[PDB]
Structures are given as C-alpha cells and as structure tokens.
C-alpha cells in the first residue's frame, strides 16, 4: 500500500501526527531525510528500511509549535513566586533554612 505521507498536506497540524514520543516511521514522517555513510560513488541511504534513523531518539513529537501549544495548556497548573522575594538577599533573610534533596530518573522496572 502507498505511504500516508502522500496524503499529508503542506499546512497540516504536525503535533496531531506525532502526539507523543514514537519511533521513526518512514511512512509517517514526510521528509526525504537520508542517513548513512555513503559507499564509493554512492549516496546516504533512504529512510525506508533505515535502521540508523530508527535508532535515533527523534524529537518529532517536540517541535516549537507543539512545545508552545503544550506550555500554553500547562499554565493552568502553575502558581506565582511571591514577588516580595526579589533576590537571594531576601530569600536568605525571610527563609534562613535551605533544604537540599535530590531525585533520580533512570530507566528500568524499579
């Protein structure tokens, strides 16, 4: 069957094509991007069947349009810094104690 990038318009809503982190789909990404060390009198390989493009952690789901649209919807969740605390001079005056704690984000089951 023919790839659906042939049906994608030049003014589509790209974030709706890649909402979340997804692997590179050469039938969904409408770019003639090539990757690979070319052979003698050769060219970098095409995307269809390219394992190297599939090995990249692509940022197609985070484009500037998508990021701005995300961060406009996430503003509802935020609070405001008390404006009285303009600088560290007052952060060390009104709140003498500082508590430092760390979180770690790895990949795995645990």
Partner 1 sequence: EVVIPKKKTWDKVAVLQALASTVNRDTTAVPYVFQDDPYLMPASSLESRSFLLAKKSGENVAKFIINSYPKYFQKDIAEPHIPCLMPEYFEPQIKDISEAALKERIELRKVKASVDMFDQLLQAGTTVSLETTNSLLDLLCYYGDQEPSGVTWRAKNNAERIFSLMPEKNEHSY
Partner 2 sequence: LHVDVPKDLTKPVVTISDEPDILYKRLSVLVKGHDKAVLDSYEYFAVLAAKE
Partner 3 sequence: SLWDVEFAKQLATVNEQPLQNGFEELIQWTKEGKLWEFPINNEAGFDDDGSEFHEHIFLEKHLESFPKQGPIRHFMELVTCGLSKNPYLSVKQKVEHIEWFRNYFNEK
Please choose, from the candidates 44, 61, 62, the residue with its C-alpha nearest in 3D space to the C-alpha of residue 53. Answer: 44
The C-alpha atoms of residue 27 and residue 8 are separated, in whole angstroms, by: 11
SS3 category, 61: coil
Binding mask 2-21 for partner 1 (x = CB under 8 A): xxx--xx----x-xxx-x--
Please choose, from the candidates 56, 62, 76, 73, the residue with its C-alpha nearest in 3D space to the C-alpha of residue 19. Answer: 62
Q: Please report whether residue 78 would count as binding partner 3 according to CB under 8 A.
A: no
The C-alpha atoms of residue 102 and residue 35 are separated, in whole angstroms, by: 39
- Residue 68 is inside which H or E element, if any? helix 64-73
Q: Please report whether residue 81 would count as binding partner 3 according to CB under 8 A.
A: no
Whichever of 22 and 56 has its CB closer to partner 3, that residue is 22
Whichever of 42 and 108 has its CB closer to partner 1, that residue is 108
Contacting positions for partner 2 (CB under 8 A): 13, 57, 59, 62, 64, 67-68, 70-72, 76-77, 79, 81-82, 85, 88, 91, 95, 98
Contacting positions for partner 1 (CB under 8 A): 1-4, 7-8, 13, 15-17, 19, 25, 27-28, 69-70, 73-74, 76-77, 79-80, 82, 84-85, 94, 109-110
């Amino acid at each position: 069957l023919p790839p659906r990038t042939e049906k994608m318009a030049v003014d589509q809503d790209w974030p709706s094509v890649y909402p979340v982190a997804a692997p590179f789909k050469p039938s969904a990404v409408p770019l003639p991007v090539r990757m690979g060390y070319p052979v003698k009198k050769g060219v970098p390989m095409a995307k269809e069947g390219n394992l190297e493009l599939l090995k990249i952690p692509n940022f197609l789901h985070l484009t500037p349009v998508a990021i701005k649209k995300h961060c406009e919807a996430l503003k509802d969740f935020c609070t405001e810094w008390p404006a009285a605390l303009d600088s560290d001079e007052k952060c060390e005056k009104h709140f003498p104690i500082e508590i430092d704690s760390t979180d770690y984000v790895s990949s795995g089951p645990s």
